[PDB]
Symmetry: D2
Subunit: 205 residues, 4 copies
Amino acid sequence: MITENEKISLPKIDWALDALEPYISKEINDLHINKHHVAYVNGYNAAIDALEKAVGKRDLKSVVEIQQNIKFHGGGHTNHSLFWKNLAPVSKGGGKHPDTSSALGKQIVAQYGSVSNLIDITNSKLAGIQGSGWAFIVKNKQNGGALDVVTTANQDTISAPHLVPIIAIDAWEHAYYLQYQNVKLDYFKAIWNVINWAEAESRYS
Amino acid sequence: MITENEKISLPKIDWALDALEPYISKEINDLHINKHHVAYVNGYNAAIDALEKAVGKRDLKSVVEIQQNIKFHGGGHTNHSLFWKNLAPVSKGGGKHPDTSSALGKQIVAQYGSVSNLIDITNSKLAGIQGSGWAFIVKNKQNGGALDVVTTANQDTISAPHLVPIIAIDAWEHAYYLQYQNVKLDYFKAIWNVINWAEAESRYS
Amino acid sequence: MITENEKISLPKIDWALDALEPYISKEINDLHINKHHVAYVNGYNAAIDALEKAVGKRDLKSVVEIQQNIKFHGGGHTNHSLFWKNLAPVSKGGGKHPDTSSALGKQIVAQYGSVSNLIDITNSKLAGIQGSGWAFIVKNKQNGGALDVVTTANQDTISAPHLVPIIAIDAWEHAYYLQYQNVKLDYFKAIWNVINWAEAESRYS
Amino acid sequence: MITENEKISLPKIDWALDALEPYISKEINDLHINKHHVAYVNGYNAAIDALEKAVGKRDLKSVVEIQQNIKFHGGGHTNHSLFWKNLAPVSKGGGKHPDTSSALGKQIVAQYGSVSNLIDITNSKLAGIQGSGWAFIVKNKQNGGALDVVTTANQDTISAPHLVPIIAIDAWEHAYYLQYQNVKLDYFKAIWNVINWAEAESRYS
Ligand SMILES: [Mn+2]
Ligand SMILES: [Mn+2]
Ligand SMILES: [Mn+2]
Ligand SMILES: [Mn+2]
């Protein structure tokens, strides 16, 4: 029994399916959003509906079973929503580095010395992921807004109340396979050319 | 916003806190039910209440965070509820083996040859558990009601719609530490002297 | 310090890269074996070499870190080795069902009633997998050689001494994406047309 | 085939079994070291011996199975070794806070404002742990030696080459049950009265 202000939907994306070429093919973006993300949107909504029913009648065997789907689709929708938002065509700023005069920029130089180095780290983490997963540049609000590079598995997302996702990078094969196939190393590097750091600076404050 | 027919409570136990001695001390049973299980009952109820709120306003970061607690307390309540139900004083049948003429009994002799052997297996699994967890004798309804011995971690419980828990055995230290301390091997053996197989036969049908 | 009889290598495959069309494209088989499996072969070998070094000098921080890679590449090599072996061109028997007069065949009809039904189950499990993973039809030797359908995550493999993998099915996107993309449901169905049941019957004894 | 410089042993502890009272009973310390830690020491050694054998003959099914035990006992030995080292009798400094003039001290005030607050955080994390696990105050060397409070499950330990454990706190029930039973909240608070911050400052450099 999912209600109006409970259900989610696919977000409006601020760029064209081909606006990220030649770094990300429109064939991927098409399938990824409209195919993969749509599946998560449907999954979360159906999972919530299934809960009001199972919970509504004290069936914990089902309640516990449905939990997984909610973590998966709910985290999937969240991750991809973050993903599109920190992506932009080179035209609209994509690939433009954080300002040496911005809060986020100064923080990267203090902890990592340069945005360049932070990328080598994030890329190493991404290449490290075994199976499906994500990489994040997170801000920890409980230890003085310190930045860190964290890796989640599958659809898991930054859910800790004190953690705030700054940049999300998809490591699922579906994200890069049609264009890069096995060579995920090329995809990890290339994607920085379309990363919307303006959104990162926005999230940092 | 947890409602009446949604919230759970502590189940009525069919034996006295000392009725399982000298296999399980009343000091343990007291703390375990009234202390550990009570904590799970409170946890599940608060977790559900927290959902109607987070879900009610499309806050997936919280929705995903709360998921874990629901799996934990909800699975904890379920496991312990199963646990008390397959425990009984030697007086009330505890420790009495499955009938060689019952469905469950015949199934144990077909797959394991004897209840004796099934116990050595279950005990080996229990001793195998690293950290907190449970052991189960489950009936798989999708492959001809075949029995199997499975091990879950922490509060995880048999949630698969086709799987049916026949016997639950707690492997958490809290279950046996006050009386057996480190020697979990003694606890695993001794507990069979108070296992209510009558409840197992009940669950098998 | 990995030695001769310790190191692994890519197995000789008994069919041509295109012998499984139009169910599995040669473009996939090429990349999968020669690209994905090769990566696992290299991974396991390097992981073992790294151990003799870390273990050789009581560096448990590294020893524990290397453990993961050994589970991953070692399990990856094992899974794919099983995968090729239970695949065959329709010509060489691929897609031919288990004999109603064979041990494995009779076991499928006893537990599942028909090979047909066992496939619907395995397909449901495969579709259930969240993220990367595998599906297996396993024989449990400790409960009377009973068959069951189990799902592992990532490169995890059937390692339990009492469990024996009968059929392995890859659920990683890399296995089916180039040809089926998102529609994994089509891949799961189609792959049965090239499953080598003769190898399954071989493994069952 | 475990060799001399490969095998581990129980470390020499710098305090008496009762030197931590009334915060940690000697009954616990006895059982914990000599009972729990000893079990891990034996586990790691046997696990390594079992590897030289399985690996020595390309049996990956066993190699992958043994991996888990090595992660568990190897991580268990590491965690407890860290644990004793950051524990001390109030006499020998236990409970004495980090110097406002030391590197570690200044870092705690910059990120957390006070050691007091860092403890409330660590305690919240510890209380958050579901099942068996540990809590750590770690120094990340790849982002400017920033401090963070992390929680591992079971015997998992800080293995990341860039992470350095500063303080380890055991969250297993065996650590506090005999004296505090269920009330882990009391144990988490009380243990700070015997935490050896001098060792933390040592690890920070
Ligand atoms: Mn994706
Ligand atoms: Mn319990
Ligand atoms: Mn594969
Ligand atoms: Mn311990």
